[PDB]
């Protein structure tokens, strides 16, 4: 789809955790 | 600036990551 | 029947998923 | 060989979600 959303994540460590999951899910969707 | 912006493609993934973020925040709030 | 064993490769991913799992369990308890 | 770690996850929907995230992270790592 063409819809983008933003989430404000408190703290660098939590951001990197969620960023990694987000990127991984995006990559998996692209590869499916 | 204590919050970092996560850009997410798709509403389902947004809702998932929002739910996880909320759970992580609650876990932090309850940490000893 | 409600428990499943998640098989994970590597300590880093284990710690990430363990943290999320614990946080989801806590959110459930407070829902 | 790989070093496996295990987590006990309560609930099939939660298990399948965390399994999906786990698999996506594995894919992202494999893709470098």
Residue numbers in the entry:
A (entry chain A), D (entry chain B): 1 to 32
B (entry chain C): 2 to 33
C (entry chain D): 2 to 32
Please, what does the article write about this entry?
The p53 protein is a transcriptional regulatory factor and many of its functions require that it forms a tetrameric structure. The four domains include a central core DNA-binding domain, an N-terminal transcriptional activation domain, a tetramerization domain (TD) located just C-terminal to the DNA-binding domain, and a C-terminal regulatory domain that is controlled through numerous post-translational modifications. Next, two dimers come together to form the tetramer, which is stabilized by a helical bundle that forms through a series of hydrophobic and electrostatic contacts between the side chains of the amino acids located in the four α-helices from each monomer.
Of the six mammalian p53TDs tested, the OP-p53TD is the most thermostable. As seen with the TS-p53TD, there are also two major structural differences observed in comparing the structure of the OP-p53TD with the structure of the HU-p53TD, and these differences occur in the same two regions. In the first region, L350 and Q354 in the HU-p53TD correspond to L322 and H326 in the OP-p53TD, and in the structure of the OP-p53TD, the imidazole rings from the side chains of the H326 residues from the adjacent monomers are in proximity (2.9 Å) to form a hydrogen bond between each other. The second key difference between the OP-p53TD and HU-p53TD structures occurs in the hydrophobic core formed between the four helices. As seen with the TS-p53TD, this substitution at position 341 leads to a series of subtle difference in the packing of the side chains that form the hydrophobic core between the four helices in comparison to what is observed for the HU-p53TD. Together, these two differences not only help explain the enhanced thermostability of the OP-p53TD in comparison to the HU-p53TD, but also explain why its thermostability is similar to what is observed for the TS-p53TD.
